[PDB]
Write a protein that binds this ligand. Structure first.
Ligand SMILES: CNCC[C@H](Oc1ccc(C(F)(F)F)cc1)c1ccccc1
Ligand code: NA
Ligand code: NA
Ligand SMILES: [Zn+2]
Length: 208
């Protein structure tokens, strides 16, 4: 346990609910706070082609019934263990996974791991576990309207505001408590959690 655990978000939404744009805006806002960038993890087995310790890793379109290999990898990523992603297949040197944020999205209502033990392990890692709701005036034919939603309407974590950012077009609902957030509010909550985990007091508390 030498690593601070990444702060992890899981977004559940129907197809066309804006999941991919939401994770890429949340990730870019967080990544810029850390003077870094976003990396989308390839879904295929050697998942880390292009990984350069970017501050934000995104996993889009998680399936409802993941492979044991996928569960295993995810549980390593979102933990305090030092580990080297599978890079030998890419003929690239082993580098440590050090990204402090992991964002994922799924069309599944609930992720079912192979065993209930694995389901518990996933649940303790999805620190922010949120449902996406698209507001009906910003959706047509089940698809979020991006021109409408990005048109400039101030926000805390973005330069300009738009319906996507301030909760007019898309909202996030906490799956446990039903508390509701805009995208802007969610970035604040996630960065606050990152600061909590890196604070001196928190890291010292772990010595007892
Ligand atoms: C074959 N297509 C799905 C492969 C895989 O799906 C996953 C689904 C769930 C998880 C979990 F649960 F977070 F571990 C991890 C991966 C995935 C999805 C997106 C990015 C990397 C891996
Ligand atoms: Na948490
Ligand atoms: Na509509
Ligand atoms: Zn706005």
């Amino acid at each position: 346990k030498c690593r601070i655990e990444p702060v992890c978000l899981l977004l559940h939404g129907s197809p066309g609910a804006g999941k991919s744009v939401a994770t890429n805006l949340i990730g870019r806002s967080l990544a810029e706070k850390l003077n870094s960038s976003v990396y989308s993890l390839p879904p295929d087995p050697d998942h880390f082609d292009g990984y350069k310790q970017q501050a934000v890793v995104i996993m889009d379109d998680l399936c409802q019934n993941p492979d044991g290999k996928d569960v295993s990898l995810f549980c390593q990523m979102v933990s305090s263990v030092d580990f080297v992603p599978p890079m030998a297949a890419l003929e690239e040197k082993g580098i440590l996974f050090t990204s402090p944020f992991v964002l994922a999205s799924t069309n599944a209502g609930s992720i079912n791991a192979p065993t209930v033990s694995d389901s518990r392990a996933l649940a303790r890692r999805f620190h922010f576990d949120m449902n996406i709701e698209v507001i009906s005036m910003y959706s047509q034919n089940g698809k979020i309207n991006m021109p409408m939603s990005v048109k400039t309407c101030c926000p805390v974590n973005f330069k300009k505001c738009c319906p996507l950012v301030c909760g007019k077009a898309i909202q996030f609902i906490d799956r446990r408590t039903q508390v509701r957030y805009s995208l802007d509010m969610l970035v604040t909550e996630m960065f606050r959690e990152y600061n909590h985990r890196h604070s001196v007091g928190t890291t010292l508390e772990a010595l007892f």
